[PDB]
């Protein structure tokens, strides 16, 4: 179809390897939840502009959790909350401060890639897993699909907008 394929409505699916999923967050709270139920749990939480430090509730992987959040920018903030085993408390692994409200997740090269840092200079980073194929995602906002070969385009969107 189009190289920027979408938008698609919120759903749950197992992303194929080699394709960036670009999610256009349009509200606060949980953007997506992704797990293989074995060694990888990531949830992305959206925090609106100028939020003083506070503990908010988020339902993730079916359970209500309290996360400490803040955002001292005009830009939107996206926190990666992770755990690698079912018994561990989630920790804030990475952040993305963004004027464009776009977050990205990719299966490639054996590991999960996401964007982090601050637009317009956000960059990618990897996360290891021993069960990449098992990782599914529940996405709560509209999203697009872009091949990994076209990451330069994905990077422009993340940093500069659609
Ligand atoms: C060195 C390399 O090829 N790394 C790949 C990643 O792409 C790089 O991403 C940085 C930002 O993090 C720069 O844009 C650099 O030019 C890119 O080469 C890529 O994000 C991941 C996932 O597709 O694959 C790495 O191999």
TrEMBL record:
Location of this chain's protein in the cell: Virion
Segments forming domain Haemagglutinin outer capsid protein VP4 concanavalin-like: 4-162
UniProt similarity note: Belongs to the rotavirus VP4 family.
Protein name as it appears in the record: Outer capsid protein VP4
Name of the encoding gene: VP4
Residue numbers of the full-length protein present here: 65 to 223 of 775
């Amino acid at each position: 179809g189009s190289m920027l394929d979408g938008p698609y409505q919120p759903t749950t699916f197992t992303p194929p390897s080699d394709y960036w999923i670009l999610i256009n967050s349009n509200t606060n709270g949980v953007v997506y939840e992704s797990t293989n139920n074995s060694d990888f749990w990531t949830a992305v939480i959206a925090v609106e502009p100028h939020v003083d430090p506070v503990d908010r509730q988020y339902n993730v992987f079916g359970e209500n959790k309290q996360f400490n959040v803040r955002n001292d920018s005009d830009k939107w903030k996206f926190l990666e909350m992770f755990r690698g085993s079912s018994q561990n408390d989630f920790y804030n692994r990475r952040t993305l401060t963004s004027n464009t409200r776009l977050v990205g997740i990719l299966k490639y090269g054996g590991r999960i890639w996401t964007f982090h840092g601050e637009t317009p200079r956000a960059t990618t980073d990897s996360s290891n897993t021993a069960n990449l194929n098992g990782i599914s995602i529940t996405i709560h906002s509209e999203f697009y699909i872009i091949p990994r070969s076209q990451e330069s385009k994905c990077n422009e969107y993340i940093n500069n907008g659609l």
